[PDB]
Every structure is written in C-alpha cells, then in structure tokens.
Coordinates of N, CA, C and O in Angstrom, one line a residue:
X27 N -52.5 53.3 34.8 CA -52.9 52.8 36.1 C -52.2 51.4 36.3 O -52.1 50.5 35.4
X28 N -51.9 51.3 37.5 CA -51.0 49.6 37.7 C -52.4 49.3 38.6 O -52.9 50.0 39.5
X29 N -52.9 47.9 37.9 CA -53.4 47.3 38.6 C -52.8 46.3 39.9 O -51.6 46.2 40.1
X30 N -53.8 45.6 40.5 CA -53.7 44.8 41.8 C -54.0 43.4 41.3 O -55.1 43.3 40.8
X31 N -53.4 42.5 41.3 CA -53.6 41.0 41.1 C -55.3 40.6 41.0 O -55.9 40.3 40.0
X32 N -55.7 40.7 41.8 CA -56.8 40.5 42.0 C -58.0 41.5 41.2 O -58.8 41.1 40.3
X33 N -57.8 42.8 41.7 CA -58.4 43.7 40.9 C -58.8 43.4 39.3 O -59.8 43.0 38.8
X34 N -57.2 43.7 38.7 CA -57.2 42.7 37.7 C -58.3 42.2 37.0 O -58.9 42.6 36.1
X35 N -58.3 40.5 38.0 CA -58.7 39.6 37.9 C -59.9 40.1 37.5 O -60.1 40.0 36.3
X36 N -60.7 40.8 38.2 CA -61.7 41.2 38.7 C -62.2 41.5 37.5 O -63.2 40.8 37.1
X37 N -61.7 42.4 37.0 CA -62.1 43.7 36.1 C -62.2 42.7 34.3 O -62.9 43.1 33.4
X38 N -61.3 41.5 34.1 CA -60.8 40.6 33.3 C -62.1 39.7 33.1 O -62.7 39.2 32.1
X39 N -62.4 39.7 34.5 CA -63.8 38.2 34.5 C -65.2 39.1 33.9 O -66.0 38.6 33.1
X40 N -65.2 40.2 34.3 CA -66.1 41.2 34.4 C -66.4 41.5 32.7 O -67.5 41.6 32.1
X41 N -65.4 41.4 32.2 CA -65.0 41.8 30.6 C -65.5 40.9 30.1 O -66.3 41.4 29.3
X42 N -65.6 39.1 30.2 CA -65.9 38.1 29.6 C -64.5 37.7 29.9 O -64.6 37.3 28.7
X43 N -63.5 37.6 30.2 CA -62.3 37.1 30.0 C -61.9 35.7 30.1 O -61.0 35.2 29.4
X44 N -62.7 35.0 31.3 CA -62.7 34.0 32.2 C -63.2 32.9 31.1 O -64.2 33.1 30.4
X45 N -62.4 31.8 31.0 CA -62.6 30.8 29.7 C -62.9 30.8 28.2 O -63.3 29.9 27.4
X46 N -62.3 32.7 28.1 CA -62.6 32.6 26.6 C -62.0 31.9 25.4 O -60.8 32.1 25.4
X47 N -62.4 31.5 24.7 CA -62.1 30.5 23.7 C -61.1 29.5 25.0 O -59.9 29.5 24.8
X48 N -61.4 29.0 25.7 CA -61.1 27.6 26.3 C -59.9 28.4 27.6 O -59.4 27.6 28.4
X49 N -59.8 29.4 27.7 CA -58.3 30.0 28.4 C -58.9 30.8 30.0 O -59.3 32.0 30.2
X50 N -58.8 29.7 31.0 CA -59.2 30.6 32.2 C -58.7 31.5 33.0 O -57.4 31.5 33.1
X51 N -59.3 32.4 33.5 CA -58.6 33.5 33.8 C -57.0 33.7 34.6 O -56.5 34.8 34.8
X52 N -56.6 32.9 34.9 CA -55.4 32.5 35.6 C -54.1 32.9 34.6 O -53.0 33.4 35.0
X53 N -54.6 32.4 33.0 CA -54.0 32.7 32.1 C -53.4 34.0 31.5 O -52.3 34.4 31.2
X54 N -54.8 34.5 31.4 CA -55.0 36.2 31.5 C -54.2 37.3 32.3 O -53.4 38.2 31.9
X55 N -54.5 37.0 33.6 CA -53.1 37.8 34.6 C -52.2 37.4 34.3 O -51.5 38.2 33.7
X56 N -51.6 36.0 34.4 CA -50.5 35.5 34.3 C -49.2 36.4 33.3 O -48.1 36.0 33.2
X57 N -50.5 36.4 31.2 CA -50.1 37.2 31.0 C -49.5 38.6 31.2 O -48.3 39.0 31.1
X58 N -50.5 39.1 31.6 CA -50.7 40.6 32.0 C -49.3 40.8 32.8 O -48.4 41.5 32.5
X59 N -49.5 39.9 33.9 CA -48.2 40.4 34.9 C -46.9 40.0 33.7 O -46.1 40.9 33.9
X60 N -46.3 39.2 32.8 CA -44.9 39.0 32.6 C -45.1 40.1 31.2 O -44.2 40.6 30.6
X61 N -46.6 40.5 30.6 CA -46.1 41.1 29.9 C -46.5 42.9 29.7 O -46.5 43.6 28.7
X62 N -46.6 43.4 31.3 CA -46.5 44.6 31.4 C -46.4 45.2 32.8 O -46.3 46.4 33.3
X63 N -46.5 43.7 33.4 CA -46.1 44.0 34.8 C -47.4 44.8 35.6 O -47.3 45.3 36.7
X64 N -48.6 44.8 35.0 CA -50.2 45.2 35.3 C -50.4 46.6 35.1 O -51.3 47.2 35.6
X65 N -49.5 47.3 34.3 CA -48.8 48.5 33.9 C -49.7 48.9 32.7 O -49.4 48.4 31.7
X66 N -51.0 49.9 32.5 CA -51.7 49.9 31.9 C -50.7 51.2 30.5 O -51.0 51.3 29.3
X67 N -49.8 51.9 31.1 CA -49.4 52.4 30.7 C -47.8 52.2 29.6 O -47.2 53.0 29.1
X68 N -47.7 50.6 29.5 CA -46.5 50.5 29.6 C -46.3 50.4 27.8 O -47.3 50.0 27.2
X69 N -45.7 50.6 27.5 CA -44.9 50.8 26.0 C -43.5 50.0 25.7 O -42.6 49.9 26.5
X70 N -43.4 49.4 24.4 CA -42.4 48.9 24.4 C -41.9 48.6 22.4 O -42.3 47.8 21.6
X71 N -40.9 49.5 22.1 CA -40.9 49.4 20.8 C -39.9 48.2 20.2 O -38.7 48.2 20.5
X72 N -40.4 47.3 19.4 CA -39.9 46.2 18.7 C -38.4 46.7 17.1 O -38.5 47.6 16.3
X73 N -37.6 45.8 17.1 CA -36.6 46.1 16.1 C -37.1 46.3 14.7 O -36.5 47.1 14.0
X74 N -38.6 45.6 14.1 CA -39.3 46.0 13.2 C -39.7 47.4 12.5 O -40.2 47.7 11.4
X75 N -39.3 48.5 14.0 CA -40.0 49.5 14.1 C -41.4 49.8 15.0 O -41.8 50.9 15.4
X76 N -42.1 48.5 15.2 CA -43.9 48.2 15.6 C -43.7 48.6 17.1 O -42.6 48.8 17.5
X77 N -44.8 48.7 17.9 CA -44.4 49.1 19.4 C -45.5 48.7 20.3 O -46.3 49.5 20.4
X78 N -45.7 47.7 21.0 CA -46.4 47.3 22.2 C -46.9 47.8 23.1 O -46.3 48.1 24.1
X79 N -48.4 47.9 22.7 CA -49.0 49.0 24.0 C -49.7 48.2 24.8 O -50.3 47.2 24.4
X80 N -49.8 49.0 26.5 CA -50.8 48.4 27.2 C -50.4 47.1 28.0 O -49.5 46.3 27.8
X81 N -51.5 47.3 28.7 CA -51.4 45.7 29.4 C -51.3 44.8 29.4 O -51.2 44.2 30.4
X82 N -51.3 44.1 28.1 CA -51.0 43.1 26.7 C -50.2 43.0 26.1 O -49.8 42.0 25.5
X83 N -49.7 44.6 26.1 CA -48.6 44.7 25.0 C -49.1 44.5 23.7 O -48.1 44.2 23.0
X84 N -50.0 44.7 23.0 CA -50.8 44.8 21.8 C -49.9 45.5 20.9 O -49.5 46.7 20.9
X85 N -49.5 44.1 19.5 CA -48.4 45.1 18.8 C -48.8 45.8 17.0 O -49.6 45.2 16.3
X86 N -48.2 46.9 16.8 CA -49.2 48.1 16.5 C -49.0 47.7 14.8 O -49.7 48.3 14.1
X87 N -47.9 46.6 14.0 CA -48.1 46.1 13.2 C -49.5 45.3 12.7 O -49.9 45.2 11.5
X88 N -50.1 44.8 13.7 CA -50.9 44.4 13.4 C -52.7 44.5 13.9 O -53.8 44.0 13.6
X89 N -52.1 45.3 14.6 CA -53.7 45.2 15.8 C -54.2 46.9 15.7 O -55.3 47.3 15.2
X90 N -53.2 47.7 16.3 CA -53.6 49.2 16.6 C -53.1 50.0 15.8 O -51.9 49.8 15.7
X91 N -53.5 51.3 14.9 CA -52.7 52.2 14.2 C -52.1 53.1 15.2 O -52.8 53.7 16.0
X92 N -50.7 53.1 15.2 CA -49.6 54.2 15.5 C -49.2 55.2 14.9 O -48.3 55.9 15.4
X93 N -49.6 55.6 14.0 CA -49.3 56.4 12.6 C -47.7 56.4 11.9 O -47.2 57.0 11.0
X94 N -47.0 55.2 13.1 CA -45.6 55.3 12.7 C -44.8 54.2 12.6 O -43.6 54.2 13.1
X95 N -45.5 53.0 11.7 CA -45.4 51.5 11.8 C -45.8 51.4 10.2 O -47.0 51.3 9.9
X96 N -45.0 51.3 9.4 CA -45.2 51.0 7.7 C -45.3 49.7 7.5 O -44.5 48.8 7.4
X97 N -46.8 49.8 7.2 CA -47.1 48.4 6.7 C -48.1 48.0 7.6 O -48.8 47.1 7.1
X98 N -48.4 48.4 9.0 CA -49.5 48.4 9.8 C -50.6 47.8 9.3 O -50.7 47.8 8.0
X99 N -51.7 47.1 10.1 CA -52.6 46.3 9.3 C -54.1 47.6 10.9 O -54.8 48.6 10.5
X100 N -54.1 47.4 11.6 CA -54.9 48.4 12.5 C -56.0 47.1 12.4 O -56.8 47.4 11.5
X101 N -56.2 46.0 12.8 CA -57.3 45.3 12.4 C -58.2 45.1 13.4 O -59.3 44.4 13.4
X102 N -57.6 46.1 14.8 CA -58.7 46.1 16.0 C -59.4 47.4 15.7 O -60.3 47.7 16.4
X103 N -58.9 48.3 14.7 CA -59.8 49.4 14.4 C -59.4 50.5 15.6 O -60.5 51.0 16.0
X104 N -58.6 50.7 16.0 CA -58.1 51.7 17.2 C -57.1 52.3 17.3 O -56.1 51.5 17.0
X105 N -56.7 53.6 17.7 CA -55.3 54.3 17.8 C -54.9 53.1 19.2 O -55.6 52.4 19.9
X106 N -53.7 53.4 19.0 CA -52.5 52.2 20.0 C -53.2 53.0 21.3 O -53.9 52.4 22.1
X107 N -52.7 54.7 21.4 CA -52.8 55.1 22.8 C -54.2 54.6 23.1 O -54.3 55.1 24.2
X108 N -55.1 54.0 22.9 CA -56.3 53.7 23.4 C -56.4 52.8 24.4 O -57.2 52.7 25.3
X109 N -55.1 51.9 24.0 CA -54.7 50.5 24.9 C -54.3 51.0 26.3 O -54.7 50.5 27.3
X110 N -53.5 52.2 26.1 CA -53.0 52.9 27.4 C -54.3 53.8 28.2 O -54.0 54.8 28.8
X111 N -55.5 53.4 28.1 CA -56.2 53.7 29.2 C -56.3 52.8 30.5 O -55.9 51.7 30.6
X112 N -57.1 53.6 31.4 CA -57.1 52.8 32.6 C -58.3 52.2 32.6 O -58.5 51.9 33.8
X113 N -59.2 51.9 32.0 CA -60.0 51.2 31.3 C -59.4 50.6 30.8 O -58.3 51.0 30.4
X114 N -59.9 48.8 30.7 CA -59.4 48.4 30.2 C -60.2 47.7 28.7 O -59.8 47.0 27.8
X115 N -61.1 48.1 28.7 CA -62.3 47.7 27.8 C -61.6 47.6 26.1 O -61.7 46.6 25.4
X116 N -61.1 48.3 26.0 CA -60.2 48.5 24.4 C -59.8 47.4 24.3 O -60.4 46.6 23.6
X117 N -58.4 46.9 25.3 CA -57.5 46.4 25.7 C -58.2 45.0 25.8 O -57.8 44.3 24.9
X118 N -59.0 44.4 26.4 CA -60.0 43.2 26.5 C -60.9 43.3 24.5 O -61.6 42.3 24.4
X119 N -60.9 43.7 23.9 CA -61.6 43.5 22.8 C -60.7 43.1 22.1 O -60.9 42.0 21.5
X120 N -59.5 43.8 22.1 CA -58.7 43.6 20.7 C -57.9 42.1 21.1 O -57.3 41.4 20.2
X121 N -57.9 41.8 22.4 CA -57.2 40.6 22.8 C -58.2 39.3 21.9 O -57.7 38.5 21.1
X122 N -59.8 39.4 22.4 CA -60.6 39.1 21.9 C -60.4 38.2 20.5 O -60.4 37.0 20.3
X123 N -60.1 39.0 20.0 CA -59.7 39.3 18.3 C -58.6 38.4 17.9 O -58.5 37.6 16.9
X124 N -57.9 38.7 18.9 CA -56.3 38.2 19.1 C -56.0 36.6 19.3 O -55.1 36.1 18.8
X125 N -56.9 36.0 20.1 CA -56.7 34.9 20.6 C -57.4 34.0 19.9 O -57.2 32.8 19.8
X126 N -58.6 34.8 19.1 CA -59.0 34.3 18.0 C -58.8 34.1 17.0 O -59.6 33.6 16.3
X127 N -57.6 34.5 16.6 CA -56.7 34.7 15.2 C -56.0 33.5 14.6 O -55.4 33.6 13.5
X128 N -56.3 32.1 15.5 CA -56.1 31.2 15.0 C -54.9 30.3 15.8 O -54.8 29.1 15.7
X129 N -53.9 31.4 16.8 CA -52.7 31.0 17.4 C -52.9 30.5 18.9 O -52.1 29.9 19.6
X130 N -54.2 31.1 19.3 CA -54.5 31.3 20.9 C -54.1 32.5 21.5 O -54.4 33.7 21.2
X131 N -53.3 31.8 22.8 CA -53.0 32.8 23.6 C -50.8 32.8 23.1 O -49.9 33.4 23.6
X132 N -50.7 32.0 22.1 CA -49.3 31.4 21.8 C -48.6 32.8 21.4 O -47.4 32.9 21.6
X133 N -49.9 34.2 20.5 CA -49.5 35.4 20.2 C -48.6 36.2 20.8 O -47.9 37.0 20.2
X134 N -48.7 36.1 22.2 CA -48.5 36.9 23.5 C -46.9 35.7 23.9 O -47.0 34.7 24.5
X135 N -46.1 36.1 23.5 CA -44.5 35.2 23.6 C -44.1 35.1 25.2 O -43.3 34.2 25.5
X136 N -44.6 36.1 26.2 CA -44.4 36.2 27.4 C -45.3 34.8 28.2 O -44.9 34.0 29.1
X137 N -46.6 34.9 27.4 CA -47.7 33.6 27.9 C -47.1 32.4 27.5 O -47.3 31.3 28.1
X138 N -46.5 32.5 26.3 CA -45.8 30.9 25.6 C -44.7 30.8 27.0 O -44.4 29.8 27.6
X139 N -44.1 32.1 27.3 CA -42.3 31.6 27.8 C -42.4 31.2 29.5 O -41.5 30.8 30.2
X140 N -43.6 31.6 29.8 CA -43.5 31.8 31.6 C -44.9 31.5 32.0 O -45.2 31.6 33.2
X141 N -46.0 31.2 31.1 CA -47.2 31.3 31.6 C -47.6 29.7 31.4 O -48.0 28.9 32.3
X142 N -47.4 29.2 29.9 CA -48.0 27.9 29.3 C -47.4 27.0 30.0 O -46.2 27.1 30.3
X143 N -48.3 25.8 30.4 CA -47.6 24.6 31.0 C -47.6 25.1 33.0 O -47.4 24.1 33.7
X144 N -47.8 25.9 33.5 CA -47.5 26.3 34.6 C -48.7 26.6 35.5 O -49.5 27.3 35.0
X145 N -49.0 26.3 36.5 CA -50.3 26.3 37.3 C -50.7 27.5 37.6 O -50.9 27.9 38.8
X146 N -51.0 28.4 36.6 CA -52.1 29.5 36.4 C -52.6 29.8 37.3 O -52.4 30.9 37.9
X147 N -53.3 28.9 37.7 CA -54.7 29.1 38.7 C -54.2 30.0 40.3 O -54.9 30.6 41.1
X148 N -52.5 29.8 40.1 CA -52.3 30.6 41.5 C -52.2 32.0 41.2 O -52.2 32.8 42.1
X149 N -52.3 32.2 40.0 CA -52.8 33.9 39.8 C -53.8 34.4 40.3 O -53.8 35.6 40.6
X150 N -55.0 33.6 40.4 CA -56.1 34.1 40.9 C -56.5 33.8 41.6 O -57.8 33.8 41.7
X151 N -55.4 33.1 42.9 CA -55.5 32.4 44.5 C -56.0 33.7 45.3 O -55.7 34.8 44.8
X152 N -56.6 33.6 46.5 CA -56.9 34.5 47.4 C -57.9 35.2 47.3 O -58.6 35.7 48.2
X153 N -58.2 35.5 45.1 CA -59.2 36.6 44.9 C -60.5 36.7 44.8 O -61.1 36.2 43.9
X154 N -61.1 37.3 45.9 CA -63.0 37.2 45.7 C -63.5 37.6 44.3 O -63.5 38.7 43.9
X155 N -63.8 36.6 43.6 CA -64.4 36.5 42.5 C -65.8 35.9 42.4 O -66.3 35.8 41.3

C-alpha cells in the first residue's frame, strides 16, 4: 500500500510515533518518504547480501529474519515480509527498538542525509491531526 502524506502521519501518531524518544512526527514521514517513498511494499537488497524491507527500510542483518542473510541477528523477532504489510503495526515496533538502540533516528542514513537539520515539521503541514 502507498501511503498519503498525511494518512501516514496519521496512522504514525496513532502508533505512539509522535515524539518518541524526543523525535516529532515530522521526522518520521520525512523518513518514510526518502526512505521508501510511503511504499509499504518496497524492497531493497544491500552489497552485504542483507535487504531492506518496508516503509523504513528495516535491514534484515539485524532487525528481521529473511532466511537468506548469514549472520542475521532477527532482534525484532519477525520474518522481513511482515514489514511489507499494509499495516503498519510491525513496521512501527521494530523502529521502536531501533531508535532505541542507542543511535536515534541516525540508523535510517536517508533521515541523517535529507531529513536531520531540515524543517520537518512541513511534513506534516496541512494534516488534521
């Protein structure tokens, strides 16, 4: 499912998303959009072998088991395709996890390259929240 900017938003705030560990939701789409384009479906395999699922891009070395990533850690406890629902409930937990891991939101290289430093908050201009 491709989400709607707002929708999104929507569905992100709804999850707990909105200032978790310090990061408002502005942040969150921001990611979302540079790193799957709101593309719940989207996939993306790394030179390690590891492969990026979902709306996040959640990568399967360390978060999701793929059954085809040696050395895999699975530490969100979930098969990858899980991330590729249209639900996003999976996909909001293991971020969870993620942003708590000690790095922030710094994990997600698309939020360091196009998101950090940049006025967020117009991500989630216009949206009834």
């Amino acid at each position: 499912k491709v989400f709607g900017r707002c929708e999104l938003a929507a569905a992100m705030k709804r999850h707990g998303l909105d200032n978790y560990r310090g990061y408002s939701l502005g942040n969150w789409v921001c990611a979302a959009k540079f790193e799957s384009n709101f593309n719940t479906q989207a996939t993306n395999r790394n030179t390690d072998g590891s492969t990026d699922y979902g709306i996040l891009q959640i990568n399967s070395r360390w978060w999701c088991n793929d059954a085809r990533t040696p050395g895999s850690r699975n530490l969100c406890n979930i098969p990858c395709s899980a991330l590729l629902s249209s639900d996003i409930t999976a996909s909001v937990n293991c971020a969870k996890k993620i942003v708590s891991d000690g790095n922030g939101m710094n994990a997600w290289v698309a939020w360091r390259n196009r998101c950090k430093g940049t006025d967020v908050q117009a991500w989630i201009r216009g949206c009834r929240l």
